[model samples]
Target chain A: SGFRKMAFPSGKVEGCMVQVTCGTTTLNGLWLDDVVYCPRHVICTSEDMLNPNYEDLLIRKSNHNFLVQAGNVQLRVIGHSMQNCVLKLKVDTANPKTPKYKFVRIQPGQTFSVLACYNGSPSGVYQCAMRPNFTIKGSFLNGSCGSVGFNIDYDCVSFCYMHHMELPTGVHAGTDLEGNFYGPFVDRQTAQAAGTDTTITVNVLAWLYAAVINGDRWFLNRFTTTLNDFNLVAMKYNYEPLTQDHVDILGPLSAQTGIAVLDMCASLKELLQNGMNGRTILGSALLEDEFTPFDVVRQCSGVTF
Target chain B: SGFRKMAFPSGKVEGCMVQVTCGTTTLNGLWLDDVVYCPRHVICTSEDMLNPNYEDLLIRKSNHNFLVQAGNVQLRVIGHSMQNCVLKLKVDTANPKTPKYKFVRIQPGQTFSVLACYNGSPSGVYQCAMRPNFTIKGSFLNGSCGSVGFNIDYDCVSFCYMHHMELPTGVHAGTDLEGNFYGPFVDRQTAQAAGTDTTITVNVLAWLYAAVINGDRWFLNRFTTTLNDFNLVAMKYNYEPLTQDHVDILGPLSAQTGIAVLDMCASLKELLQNGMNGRTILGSALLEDEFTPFDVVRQCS
Candidate 1:
């Protein structure tokens, strides 16, 4: 009565480990107090339950609720005890300026609940993945009242979506033999071994769009269709300024990607320029940015990249 | 920069109307201030934009953000100017004691946003359906500062689920000419018209489960498997105490359904009992519950 489970999904991040306290006993993970709570949220795979090494941690039970306590985090998981179900625990080390936790569950398709915190902003666009919990048809709010927990259950509302983050390996720098600026390899030995088959392999638009769009068929279809009409490479670095056609094609796509077209244009401009040893605009090998194009993309998209 | 769009999905409730104020000049719904704002949230369907019938109410514009202002609800719908996209307007007349608004959006698979309210309980079990918004990969917070709307966008989190409500039509009561209790028809004429096909289709267990489970393949597989063995009718009003067989089956099912097994048993007992006139249990015609067995079923399992 005093606690409500703010149910959410563990976004397919498999083979995660956990450290939890049920009542007095501190275990890695248990099926108990009527439920299962683990930080590194993971479903009980066949191996974990059967492995001799995990016998102590993977305590099994029939269907029952569960209790979890992780310092500042105390959650009561109720009514879900299925092999498919798993507990996920997240700790925001950043202690973000606007500390808000949005709780949502994907039980099947379109049912939603949110975890509301006092003195916190509710409208933070979080990029947490949603995994479906299909047992019950209800939404709950799991909160705190001092050392105690607060729970609220309400009608279901809303949808589920995911955001993809783009990451670049490393920036290419340094000058190669014969005064040609080539690379950023972990070490110069690796760069030198490449000889010079350097095309830079910048498929920023295609790669970035695919990652951000993830697996959304609807958006993919629209994007794939839009991709056909325009040349992303040319759009990336055209001698002339982009016309309304560019905006017409890329504007909506940029909005969805959460990256602006102007930003993309600027980033690509800097990216295309090669590092110069004596200012000849070195026609180099593996000429990528010190902040890889991927990093720039992620930055332009507003992620901490 | 100060505002973040707390994006959410408007479950496919069609043909809704809205009353909103964009900047100052209030219109039914508009495409303005770099946006379109409306309650009774709706997408600009082909008819509304084209139909001269609604030229005033349904306004149109190029792709942009949107702003909506209701009595207490102030939202800014940003970056979603797609035909497939829609704005939903929800007014909680209940002004619920635990006023928590959970903002979530279904943009394809799993992305979420939350609307947190200060001084309000966060753990209320709400039954709002999630609709998918396929444009952006972000979540947001839409709140208040005196009269100004607040926004906070963050990383994604969680899944989506929906609850179902069970409501019985009406209760059945009264007796027939033969003094047999029949009943609960709007008028006796309707009840008499049915004559006596009276096999009260009480597929409560089946129907209620279907609605609550909604389209969960995982639970459905488990449930349909469990349901295969037990006879729901006999289980409703059994002779002997439900063996471990009944509890084993119903216990887990009860937890998921959020309805207890004991409550189901008690309600079904009354549902099975007919009206009494003196001694003989009255049963001649449409012998349903004044609380219709449907009502009892809704109350029960």
Candidate 2:
């Protein structure tokens, strides 16, 4: 009857945040399992929570709901201290007019509630967001400090974007250039309010690096989108967009730029075709299996020089 | 050349200990590549160590001269650490009279000189043995210390055995009754000596357990060369030979026993009619897959 915590293999829930956006429209809300995603997210009537099977619990609203039944949906437990939490959703609804939901962040030590809504309804998409602050107090290999930030999606597809920052003593606090997705997704006005924020610059550079490294023709094609549209929007406040040459410099550097590129490509493709579905994409298996050829070139080239 | 330490995945050696039993008297040592079997053992080289195109590296040595064809010998690395190794020997030898040179043991970290004496011997059968000791001490999940050992045969059959000691402080040692072959090819004398040294009873419980659990009719049958003679020998051992009950028990437990009783029966029947070539009376493949009816009885009844 009440919001129950979605448990994952990793551990207990700490905090979770979800954001649902369709084009320019964004609706922000916290998920209450009983209120949002019905029977699926509910705790069983019995006291034994050990054997909760969510699939049988979910009450399907309609026979024709494609979103709830189609493909696998990755559910991340966001917040502090969350280790191995993940949920998978099966979309069944075939409705074309329904807006697909995309997730922004899910942290460790947090429980997630699935919102119950039907196809063609404006209420179907709701944005739930949470930020769990973490600090790496201990030292790690090579004297580097363990990372401190919220891991939005814990599964392989999940990515992290840093918010508040305190550089470790004797270490630089600049962009984690080697990180998978180390760029900001904020707008210029938001960036200005943040004071000397490196969000837009880092985001554009990250996107460019992704495209160049991934060798995705389509992703390379979208670099002009940030240069012309996003940069102009940011330049209204004298915000500078990273130059093409600055982005081109990494062309010779071989690293796992394919992950960034593929992420950008899939994100752009999803944004263009289906609006956005908040599913995470992990490229580790692909990298390990040498699936993407473009990534291989970058990897090989990086090792060459 | 001095033995080179071969590296393999998981930081373990290939074919740490390999034993080649002369399955057929006509066949001598197999033509092996340094890549085919480890220098220490006759186990087939791991696939990853090969050039990816080659599989099934076994070569029968049928020549009598025993000169390994220069091109046929190959070297192979086995196991995660590559400590255990193999050498594929393609010898030029045919059937010969002598059966004395039927077995040999190849030691780990040794060169082909270990196998050189058996190379050109007139007897076509030769056995190779090797045992690679563990280089690192490992902690077991049961809070015990342990080591891993491997045994490989020339036919590419492999067995791994882990030796662990130091039971929990409060628990008494030898509390468990199950007797497993702890290490590969444990020397019978050493086992007897150890058993005598321990406070445990000196009864042949392991052999008795194997006899009962495995229904080893082959051993009873093999005690005598003739069928009628074997029956008498079986009776002398206080066992009935080839009775309906014996067949019923032996039929199903053959797999566990690692013996093919039914095939042995057929082979013995044939041997009575015609002389034997000592080729496997029972096919290895059939012996590997055949399950006895006794297994079902054990599972249910």
Candidate 3:
């Protein structure tokens, strides 16, 4: 039979919404066809358990579909009807780069549950959620992700997962009375209210300073973690000679908040004094040609950040 | 980072109880992480269903894990901790060889369920169940699994599921003075009461003899739906063998509980003597090799 079902002659599609959790992670979103997906790689899950809510009722059931294992999660299908059922699964507990989805066919008589193949990444988890057919119209392939619908009576693996891009709130810049600097808020008012007015530097710093002035003690710390990792912050700061001023600004930092907040002040100052490139202390104990403060900040702000 | 929880420092694990169903399966167990697992291989599950009371509730869960297709099943979280809570999964409806598990770490925050990897056979379905640590002790590696306590206050892979040898009351075989043979009973008294007196050289004969003395009129036809296929019984197995003795013995059979008993006795005989090896007779007919009488009786009686 053809792989698509342009029409649902005898039955229709029914979907539902459900959430699944992996230790520290729980996935709740949209799903498409994972049966025929692009990414396929290593999967990592260990022997798993079924939730007791379902398990309790399950133990006393009279009929079941099958017993399934996805990496470390275990599942079983207990029942269904003549309609097209869309089930989405998250294979990895919390990792996003590793998951897939699809819709399948089942019936009242021949319909059953069994361990089936998984198309999700080893880094992904499998948790299926359903929804009414109305929810999947343009979700097949991206938008008109347009996939072939169903065949004679079965949907040739329709994709059913929770995936969608969040809308950007946009950024703004301004500052505080101290001109200490802040922001990258949703707007001028939003930034002003968040405190230090707005941006004195770039993207992350844009929000960091604002976070500090607005009592967002948590903001700069956000960037702090990013800066300390790799040759980012530690590479340029830690081992270097600390000026009285640098110590003043840098003292508040601890390995705990690994971002570059306190470190940003030092980097920004170096930018102001050393011109466009960055600090290059000559004939000193710690000076390597190009690897400067600017270089480290630049690395931390890339898409990876 | 050093991997020793040393203690449950901040928050404690609050495990939940939720069961999942794929298309044809369900798994009720615990988990650690489902990354590392045991060997995997092809799997086949004849369209079978388990219906206790939950089977009804199971048919109505709204959403499921997935309608997976598995050729093999692998599971080996072999271990876990208290911090990174482990949550594993099984991608099948029901079976042993097709499942995986694990324990993962989580914070009081950012703990949203997202899609992860699945360890199941192409023949696997996606059914997941969840439980707590206490419910998972003797659940992995033949039960003696030894895992790290918890690294940094978290064990990345724990285990859970519901599997047991169950009690030997698993089989009931016997009949009575009442001429009834129904048992998998653990108590001998129960088995003896079901009746244990005979087996004919052939199946019809076996049931005929049992029926004459014990009277189960439906002896050979006992299995009712032999359950080996989706459409086996739906095909036909109704009256006519009444080969004198067949009927004479059948006469007491309920000749005892009539559900169209007389006709059934006749039909059961024909199906036995001339069975379906899928192929008939001579080189030109549909027949294979020695289907031996015991095999026939085995198939029926």
Candidate 4:
């Protein structure tokens, strides 16, 4: 949908526009179920003003894919939905404490469609019916009714670069040194999915966390390719390459300039250790075994300084 | 240790010689405790003339490092066990069912040493007391008597090139096109430790398993570096870079030449599914979570 005028009152800021580059899933979106959800942009569902649990739901959008939260409303395909992929929702009165509606497929079909209700009517339509025999990575309504879609968007850890004028309010945004937006997330939850939850200046800091914590050298070596690709892409677009400080920071960790390696690793890990998972729908048990920034910093500190 | 003349009486063949290039641990020895056990070679411990459990014991040898199989033998430092690294083993009469012994350090020592007993006494000396502050990756006898050394050699999956006139009997050797040796392993157990327990032609087949099974793209991409390194090392020593069949096999799986990706992966997985762990010093409970060759083949298949 176009920028909500109320969200950005003074429209069209100079040198900034709402543009997206639909590159490969590596830099654009998540690859799941053998399909790429390219150009991962946010798509919040139109709220039903009468529903009290409206504040707890989120709908993530992409160019041709949509990840809708499973809420109290039961969903169904109205009549012979055909390619128009109409989804009808009704209140689930059976379980008042945690009510959720199911989307039952009345017929054996090969269409996966979602309707983006804009101001109460369908504004944009997204149908992922391209693969007839593809597997669904996350929870979708079954032929019967039960569904599960908790933090499914985390699969796409990267977002397509978006140039927005007056940034959306209350949500979060990632920017370069000049304050230009690169990732305008829907909220902290979506930002966490995009891996921009905290202010990380250099990408290698996160990579260092992965390599040091996971005991995998591939993460450290992948940085060279990632750096080259980033710089090549930057040059192609006539955008600024990484700052000299960022480039030099990748040198000997002990003799690095700008930020100390220990400080950089420690700060990132500390942020992850403190309330990083609070906004997401994921359970603590699922993410427990995975390394946090704290582990990276601690490992580095123990081995080095 | 020279081959027991009774073991190989004919001597080495014309093209074979006991040679080894002590490269980094990737192809030499396992890297652990921040040190490389370079040049992984077999060094079986001399059997005690009177001990009946000699058949069950094995001692893996490298140029500078050795992995002694822990058995029912108690070891200790007789005196101030200096760089000579003399190890004295004594039979434990306690608990006759499964009697075992311990190694007690008699004094505060800086030198970490091992004595390779030849026919009866020390023939080669090895002391790894290089880093006084280094952390030991695996179990070594502490200042006390308690120690543990279960299959700690699995960390080194690759072996250094070895030359021998005659292939050691009762042991397995990895060969090239013309029966020439690339890795003369001591036994199938050591072969499993060196990652040659089964015949795997292509390295990427293992990589495909890592990537697909672990959902990590880095493993697939790292193949480029590994392939290039293997080829570079191969060319430097006049050894064959992977054969053309090996090279062409890297093409798309749908249009492969010699072995179908399905067959290759399925065979590897099936072999792993079989009793691959029968000879290893490792316990099945420990290696359960780790991916097997069968996993790679199945994922590829």
Candidate 5:
């Protein structure tokens, strides 16, 4: 099919272009089935992952490659060089920091082809080299479809990225960006023959809307390359980029630009403050102790401006 | 709504291009009327926009047009296609160094139906015939969005693009990048009306910020089509793309690289002892008015 144009989103603008430079999906042109989308741009193949000294990673690397098993709790991996690559697959979310390091024999050319999944959220999916909170970054550089809460607990605050390895029985055919059905790498005929249900998916369109708003510290860490954008932005504007000083900053900006950062952020802020959701696309039933953008921004903008 | 894996910012990537070489907006699985949404690519009606010499022109004889609500404010134009097309509908932005330009008799098949505007920014917009800041280049080709002053000139600063029309009262109740409200090409009771609110919008989420930052004078003019960029970028990069030693000859780069060039001067180097903004943005009463990364870096470790 030919290229089709995309519609702009309502109630959204500014900082929204999250272009996936490369991807490994079930189908081409069908961004809908993309199991793994790489936005980091760091190009590498298994050959690089195996090396311990690889540094200063970069983008658009051709040698880079990834793997996907359709929708069954999709797991992504990089490196697809020579044949004979061996993969000693293992599963187990090891102890917090003491992740008992394990090694496997190389699959001829298989290196840096897989990364561990930490949970996922609307804005992004977190996958580290071999440990959680461990980054600077990855093989598949992949993530599952889900939402996560970020409340200072790096190891496991809101880990939602999934790896079902099988399809969900039945529910909404949607609540996703695209309402499509998908399955394992196996064809429908083959999957039917092999006895594997092929209907599950990775939809979180609602979560996208539930994303933590701008100025939310946690939000930036998820969907951004700006390691410390919040900090930098704060520093750039005032002599400091503080959580509490938000009011001082907002004051000047409003007094200065007078456009609508306040009014706009307010509408979203109010809705978030009252905390609405469940059947609704923009709210969630507060996971007891959870920190959403709603909470995060509220934490900063606590005082009246 | 659980997490649905929507494709990463279609046309969302900063500095990415959507060379429409293409129109309207809307929903369901169809991502059309997506002004603010910039996909990585756009299929143009003419293959020419796909190549280089597209110069600073507009679009397909048909699709390559723009919409300006006539008379009120105006927009700019490039490629009027060989004077042979000799235009008679001249409204004019002519100047001395500029010379005269004529208009054209709209092509038979030509109607301003698809002069697509996928939301633009201050420095540059994707409404042209080719890659920007590039007298002609491509891929990573870049351009300046119009920041002539480091000053916090909010509205007066360098904003390079614009589009405005009828606003929707309230009703799917929407029709804009911020789809709070809008109208279809149709009207009440009778469908497909000869008129529409036709409110234009500029929405790419990325262009939003890439923009606000212009007028700063540091953003690079990209790999832009390899036409005359080299020469221009070189001119911008160095004063000569150089140093006192001038050992490294940054040549045609000055000509070949048609990106933006900064004026040969500096008031900032004189100030970083100064400062810069706020919750709102743009209006900053001089945190110091000096420490450009240039001066700040020169000052720090």
Candidate 6:
């Protein structure tokens, strides 16, 4: 007689690792109705794995509080009970040292909302995203989302995100040397954590980054030459005359650069204020008359390069 | 056999005063067949009264040498054998007043031409008529059929013919004030005898002579006014400004009267060689420049 039911030893096992064997081929396509556990006490349950649904599965919880805080800055997340929900909040700033990210979890049938006061470095890309449950990840945290946070700057700023695996190891400044003069460097993580390069190398990394961002080979070439010329002029003149010429040159140069020279000046001014002193007195004098040179330099320096 | 043939007179009467009565009604017309004479031995005929066509008359003589001289002038009258033909040529300018009339008895088909020279006055009208035969009087001069004589001043001069019978008294300034401008007092005979008045009286006579000469009345009015204005302006402005203005004003006064202003100004300009004064400066500095108050009164007075 063919048996219709089969049994297996079932009990709550503490700190016990269990191995289950079905005639192997990797238990192909079995829907589990039970829990699996590891010796380390991390529980794997039928509830932990997600169900496949064509529609999003939602999970929401009431009164769940989320606070993302950094050096005198904090953000509060709030929302109504969201179904099939997932949410993510991200904060990036000019300060590379303190990377910021915020995430929120929600339950099925429970409403939640978030409010955030971000006082980090008031300038960077901020972005937010929301998604629902029955999305492969959850009936648990339904809506998934993220955000970008940034401050206003005179010049245009662009941000790029690359998956960790996609980044290259090293980059070179082309013969024009404009790429080196501007920037060509790896991501800060690679350069810093790997202890790969100094400012010159970082600049090379930045150049590569900028070329990748703008997709302009010409910019990469001209940028280094323009910076070298600027440096030469600065080295040749006293600060006052340099300042005057910079004021005069800005009009024509910005026109060529297709960005506000004032913004670039602001970022440079900021870099100078921050004690990154690459410019000669002539260069400083050239930009002395412009009040917002620091902010201009900051904006320009942060733009990929 | 009750009537006899009437004889028409056909004989010369020399140096005798003969009154051939053509009748009270005035010869329905008259035709002379021979010379009639006056006692002065001057051969005469009344062609004017006889209504002859004096234009057809001619003069004739036996010899070519007949010379007359007066003052600084001399004229020779030559004659050809042809009937009633005479040719007079001036040998010198001495007698500037040349005889302008010649009388002749023209043959059956002979044509006569008259010649004249005069200045400063209208010439008398000349017409000629001949009928029956060539015996008529008063020079048989063809007043209408004449050539004007030549002189340097005479080129472009216009001639006007006026009859002595129809002249106005006193209206024309050229005439003597006390006398009839034309005649009862001066017939053509008396006028010729008193030759001093020929120019003045001819000019005056042209005014009254309008009726006989077919002169225009409007022309007479404007001509008189233009003369008066010319005289007045000329007198008022011893300088030339007013004279020019007056001429300018009178230029189109009448076709004839107005046109004469240009000639008058030209003549006046020739008379006065200094450039004429312009009136524009009169009210400004000209009078003060030219005369003091005492000078003005003395000179003006």
Question: What stretches of model 3 exceed 4 Å from their correct place?
Answer: A1-99, A102-305, B1-162, B166-262, B277-301
Ranking 3 against 5 by lDDT, winner = 3
Candidate with better lDDT, 1 vs 5? 1
DockQ of each: 0.02, 0.01, 0.01, 0.02, 0.02, 0.00
Give the per-residue lDDT digits (tens) of candidate 1, residues B81-124: 22212222233222222212222323121222222111111211
Give the Å shift of residue A131 in candidate 6. Answer: 99
* CAPRI category for model 1: incorrect
Q: Could you say which candidate leads in lDDT?
A: 1
Scored by CA lDDT, what does every candidate get? 0.25, 0.24, 0.23, 0.23, 0.20, 0.20
Per-residue lDDT for A1-305 in model 3, tens only? 00000011111111111222223223222222221111100010122122223233223433232222333444332331111111223222332222222443321111111101112211111211111111111111111111122212122323322232111111112111111112222211111222211111232232233223222342121222233342243334332222344333433332223445445544443433343231122211112211222222222221110
Task: Give the CA lDDT, 0 to 100, for residue B221 in model 6.
Answer: 28
Instruction: Provide i-RMS per model in Å.
Output: 23.3, 30.7, 27.9, 35.5, 19.8, 80.8
Worst 10 residues of 3 chain B by lDDT: B1-10
Q: For model 6, what share of native contacts is present?
A: 0.00
What docking class should model 4 receive? Answer: incorrect
Evaluated at residue A134, the lDDT of candidate 2 is 21
Model 2 stretches astray by more than 4 angstroms? A1-197, A200-230, A234-240, A250-276, A279-305, B1-301
- Angstrom error of the Cα, residue B43, model 3: value is 31
Compare candidates 4 and 5 on lDDT and give the better one. Answer: 4
lDDT of 6 by residue, A49-128 (tens): 23322122113222123223333333232332211211222222222222222212321111111111112111111111
Q: Which portions of model 5 show Cα errors greater than 4 Å?
A: A1-51, A55-242, A252-274, A277-305, B1-301
Candidate 2 lDDT, B33-67, residue by residue in tens:
22112122222234423232122323332223122
lDDT of prediction 5: 0.20
Q: Report the number of backbone clashes for model 5.
A: 88
